[PDB]
Amino acid sequence: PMFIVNTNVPRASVPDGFLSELTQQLAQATGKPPQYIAVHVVPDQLMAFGGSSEPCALCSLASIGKIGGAQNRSYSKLLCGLLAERLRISPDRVYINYYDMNAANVGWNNSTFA
Template identity: 35%
Template sequence: MPIFRIYTNTPKSEIPDGFLLQASHFIAKQLGKPESYVTVRIHPEQMMCHGGSTDPCASVELLSLGSLGPTNNEHAKAISDFIEKHLKIPRQRFFINFVDLDSSNIALGGKTFG
């Protein structure tokens, strides 16, 4: 049930075609979760700055039931590589916030996971 959210000041016109599906597949593989549970949201053209500059930047969030914690360093490297490659945002220009969700706080199909 991963949710991958990217807020960026990158213009919508510079988001590559197919990015959402590429990101969905990437997150499913990275976390070992079924892609049918993955949600990806990108919010381009945000008014934002990072480190006192409005150069291309982002705020990245990965929420998941499990698959986070001790492996976050591996995830951070893989996500940074992915964002640099596809969105051309340098890894020094975004933070990644990892959130390990409680199963009783997430529902799908009218029923919580825990």
């Protein structure tokens, strides 16, 4: 899995250990081994959500499988929770795009997962 968060929250407001928390919780939620989880946080962005520059986030979670209606609701509760607790972003100012990747369309270690 690969989880990306882009936010207008400043870098100083991202707490120490946040990338590890995300890694841990995503491994648990997706069922994937932690060695396969990648996470990427991009603060200080020039963004608006509903026309407003109050704290917001635009995110993406891509995974080979483990994407679907019920799973994605679960991930959204988890991730909006983390963004609210840690970054002080309202859940209603977060979008998370989910992507179910075919294994042939993910490169890693000089090959793909197919």
